[PDB]
Amino acid sequence: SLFELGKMILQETGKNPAKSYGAYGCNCGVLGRGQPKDATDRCCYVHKCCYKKLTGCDPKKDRYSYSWKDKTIVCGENNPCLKELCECDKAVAICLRENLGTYNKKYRYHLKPFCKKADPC
Amino acid sequence: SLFELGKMILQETGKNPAKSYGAYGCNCGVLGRGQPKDATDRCCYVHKCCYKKLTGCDPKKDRYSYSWKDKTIVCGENNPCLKELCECDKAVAICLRENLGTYNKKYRYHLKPFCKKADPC
Numbered sequence A, B: 001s002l003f004e005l006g007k008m009i010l011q012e013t014g015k016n017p018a019k020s021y022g023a024y025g026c027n028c029g030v031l032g033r034g035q036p037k038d039a040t041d042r043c044c045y046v047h048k049c050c051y052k053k054l055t056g057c058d059p060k061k062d063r064y065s066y067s068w069k070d071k072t073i074v075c076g077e078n079n080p081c082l083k084e085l086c087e088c089d090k091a092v093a094i095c096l097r098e099n100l101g102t103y104n105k106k107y108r109y110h111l112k113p114f115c116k117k118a119d120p121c
Ligand SMILES: O=C(O)/C=C/c1ccc(O)cc1
Pocket: A019
């Protein structure tokens, strides 16, 4: 759920997840996808395309088990859809930390309705 | 549109609109309505109910004219829908400012999917 996803982002980046990524660019946080504004945004683009391959679990609300082991996100047992979901979330947290170097606060509270339409996944 | 709405909120409250109200509680900013968390939140509840009659225009994207005269929001002429849209936005900016006394940051980046369902408008 948003709880695990947020903890993952905090653990990787060291940043307040909701504040830094809750409404970043055309793709991070609420709502769907748009043409990515930069690398950070594109992380969330991939992230939401990852969600489209899931098989019925709720990416926003379904809790799952994972652990922070040797400073690594390790997706726990769960069921297959939750496992894939946890992997989607792990991938975007890692990607957001990797791209901290081009993080732009001007995209932080982006007016997503004016975003250009995204290509299909 | 969001440009006018954001400027009204900034002028009345003195606060960064996107940051303080873009995701506040169950009702302010992105997405729809939910059971209000407080008075600030309930402003945005009334706000979005005010929007439900505006089926003739787009509250997020349609621009309109208004001026800031004598520290007052004055809606410009416009057509019936845009005028009403302007008055919705003026009323929430005022309400948000009037309720600054109980603004709570714990609701600033509220996880809206876990919000309880709202009463019908
Ligand atoms: O970074 C933040 O979350 C908030 C900064 C902030 C700035 C002015 C305020 O009145 C409240 C919070």
